[PDB]
Symmetry: C2
Subunit: 156 residues, 2 copies
């Protein structure tokens, strides 16, 4: 995947949620609306819950601006992803998207060289603002906090 | 496939964190134990039998089978977190065959890439004595009770 860029349409690939039989194009999540898409290296991987608490705390602020649709994506199977999501987000404010084959991550160009540590290649951390499947803003470490996310929204 | 009397594959597995790895032979060296697989942490069915093993744990110990290990093709962070939810007292060793190396060597790989992203392990339960297989069982004979009965047939 080439360097991501504002104005680009996100890769139109299938992701999974809850169970392997429930898959759908990621475009379904952001079609006709604004939202936030951010990644973690993996469910239960240290660091994966570093930012979720701030996203959750800012939910009504995101919602004020039409960004109540928030999705977390990781290269995991959906059983693991869903179980993890319930532990970090009991009110289910965040859609937990399992990029199970790493297809979205590869298409986006955000593969991590993590096979030695985790068995396969996971995603690097990013956070993006999306509008009808187009990228409005892109951030990477260290600008991947909840706050970082809100300020970008407000600049609009 | 796997046969009684064969030695289990001498490969690394992981436990808790990626930096904690060891030959799986360390788990059963010089002792009796139980090794059983699940398709994955949090996969439906993966907690069908753990409650049975835990209920029979003291009986297994009376029989000299103190070492009980669950193995899955998962990273160790996920495996350990899952283990804590199904076995909070940590009676069972939770082994992460993260690369699927043990599973492939044993010949128990499942064609599961479309359902789960990669190839996982078929379900089995084995009795081990100093890394030698003394009994092997596959579905549906992978309950706690089946394990106890296998032990008592030894």
């Amino acid at each position: 995947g080439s360097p991501i860029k504002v104005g680009d349409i996100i890769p139109d690939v299938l992701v999974y949620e809850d169970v392997p039989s429930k898959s759908f194009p990621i475009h379904d999540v952001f079609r006709g609306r604004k939202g936030i898409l951010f990644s973690v290296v993996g469910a239960f991987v240290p660091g994966s819950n570093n930012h979720i608490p701030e996203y959750l705390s800012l939910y009504d602020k995101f919602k004020e601006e039409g960004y109540h649709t928030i999705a977390c994506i990781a290269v995991n199977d959906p059983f693991v992803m869903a179980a993890w999501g319930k532990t970090v987000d009991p009110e289910h404010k965040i859609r937990m998207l399992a990029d199970m084959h790493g297809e979205f991550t590869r298409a986006l160009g955000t593969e991590l060289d993590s096979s030695k540590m985790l068995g396969n290649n996971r995603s690097r951390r990013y956070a993006m603002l999306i509008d009808d499947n187009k990228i409005r803003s892109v951030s990477t470490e260290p600008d991947i906090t909840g706050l970082a996310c809100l300020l970008s929204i407000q600049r609009q």
